[PDB]
Amino acid sequence: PVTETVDGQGQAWRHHNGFDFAVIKELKTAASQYGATAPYTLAIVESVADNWLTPTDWNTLVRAVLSGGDHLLWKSEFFENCRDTAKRNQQAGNGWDFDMLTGSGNYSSTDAQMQYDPGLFAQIQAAATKAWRKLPVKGD
Structure with missing residues (x-):
């Protein structure tokens, strides 16, 4: 988890x-x-991503x-x-998403993403839980 902190000088x-x-x-x-499909666990998936x-x-x-099913x-x-x-986003040429919303193909790495952008955080969060929900069955 990342927590952002501001200093009294406004930074x-x-x-x-x-x-955790x-x-x-x-x-x-x-x-x-529960399995990743039961409301409980994915509520957690998205709530953790809300951070x-x-x-x-x-x-x-x-x-x-x-x-197993996660991947x-x-x-x-x-x-x-x-x-x-x-x-869709790079049609506009945002300079996000392709490298950033993935992880980092080439450059942004943990750093640039961790500095965030309002539209980047929203997009990455939404995309994350979107993905991080769809498990049908669990159990071995």
């Missing part, structure tokens, strides 16, 4: 924070129990909290919707 900055285990733990719980999050803690979150629906749709959105 905005932010720091990375460690992966309680969060991972219980999303893992709902994942095993400042980066591709780094993103990939760590998905890969831990779920097992296919959550993530493969992530990659699709990210570049889908990128196609």
Whole structure:
């Protein structure tokens, strides 16, 4: 998770924070129990994304909290919707989405995304949970 902090001189900055285990733990719980499709777990998926999050803690979150189905629906749709959105947004030539809303293909990395943009944060958040929901069945 990322928290942004402002200094008394009016500057905005932010720091990375460690992966909240309680969060991972219980999303893992709902994942095993509820399945990623039951309102509870995806409510958590989107609520966690409602916080400042980066591709780094993103990939760590998905890969831990779920097992098996995560990559296919959550993530493969992530990659699709990210570049889908990128196609639409870069028609306009925003300078977002293609590299940023993905993770970072070439340049933005954790850094530029973590500095955010109002339309970038909105787009990345929406795209994330969008992806990070679609699991049909869980269990092995």
